[PDB]
């Protein structure tokens, strides 16, 4: 139904859009680990239809910024938004706007275009299951003054982290994690970007064939 509904009224402008409209590329994993540029949010609307439901579109922050022209001062809105399916795909965006609606829509489109793919597993000394309910190993991210360290935890231990990270990890599909932070967490933008980069850096650790079985590692969607 809605698949073709959206596909019909979309006229592509890029080669990736054209391939996704035709049907050469059918799965979401086919666009990622090649140096493709992603300039249309319709690609992601079509391949990941879960990122249009309101349940998957957290608005994280609204800020009121000021510019001086006295002259009189001019008021603007900055919006920070996250989107994602709860099975391995999350993105984050910022939007300028003169009105909050404009800001929000721009932020969500930039979030769709800034989409990544993560890994999941179990690497805690206290569960040793082989199911993907957490992260498989410990990772570190940074932005500005904020430093985030994410550690694997056991089942039933729900997201021991600040709220911004709670939302981002929920959307990425993580259920259990321990955290250490350093710096100024009250800058929501930088706290969020640090968590996002920590999740991205799950793909920069080198592993071996046995680690996959040992930790139940999963790249993207499960099952």
């Amino acid at each position: 139904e809605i698949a073709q509904r959206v596909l019909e009224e979309w006229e592509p402008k890029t080669k990736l859009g054209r391939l996704v409209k035709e049907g050469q590329i059918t799965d979401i994993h086919e666009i990622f680990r090649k140096g493709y540029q992603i300039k249309e949010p319709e690609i992601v609307d079509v391949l990941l239809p879960e990122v249009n439901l309101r349940e998957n579109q957290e608005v994280l922050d609204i800020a009121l910024t000021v510019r001086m022209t006295d002259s009189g001062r001019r008021i603007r809105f900055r919006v920070l938004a996250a989107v994602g399916n709860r099975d391995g795909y999350v993105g984050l965006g910022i939007g300028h706007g003169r009105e909050v609606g404009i800001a929000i829509r721009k932020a969500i489109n930039y979030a769709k275009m800034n989409i990544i793919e993560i890994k999941r597993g179990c690497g805690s000394w206290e569960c040793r299951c082989r199911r993907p309910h957490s992260i498989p190993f410990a990772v570190e991210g940074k932005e500005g003054s904020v430093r985030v360290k994410l550690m694997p935890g056991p089942r039933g231990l729900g997201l021991v982290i600040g709220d911004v990270g709670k939302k981002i990890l929920t959307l990425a599909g993580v259920q259990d994690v321990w955290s250490q932070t350093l710096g100024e967490t009250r800058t929501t933008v930088n706290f969020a970007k640090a968590v996002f980069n920590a999740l991205y850096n799950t793909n920069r650790v080198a592993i071996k064939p046995e680690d996959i079985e040992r930790y139940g590692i999963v790249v993207g969607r499960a099952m």
Binding site: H29, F32, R33, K34, G35, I116, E117, Y200, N203, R204, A206, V219, G220
Partner: protein, 55 residues
């Protein structure tokens, strides 16, 4: 599914890295993969079959 691996070093390619890939110019049978860091730092590469040994 599978995850590709750089040919100069041996590290997995990340999702939104500025990496590239192409077919060995001399042979035509293999696919050379190159990661962002190796490209910006000019790390040399050597084809597995022939050994043409380019940048």
């Amino acid at each position: 599914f599978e995850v590709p691996v750089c040919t100069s070093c041996g590290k997995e390619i990340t999702p939104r890295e500025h990496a590239t890939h192409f077919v060995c110019p001399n042979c035509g049978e293999a696919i050379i993969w190159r990661c962002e860091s190796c490209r910006v730092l000019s790390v040399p590469y050597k084809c597995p079959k022939c050994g043409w040994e380019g940048p």
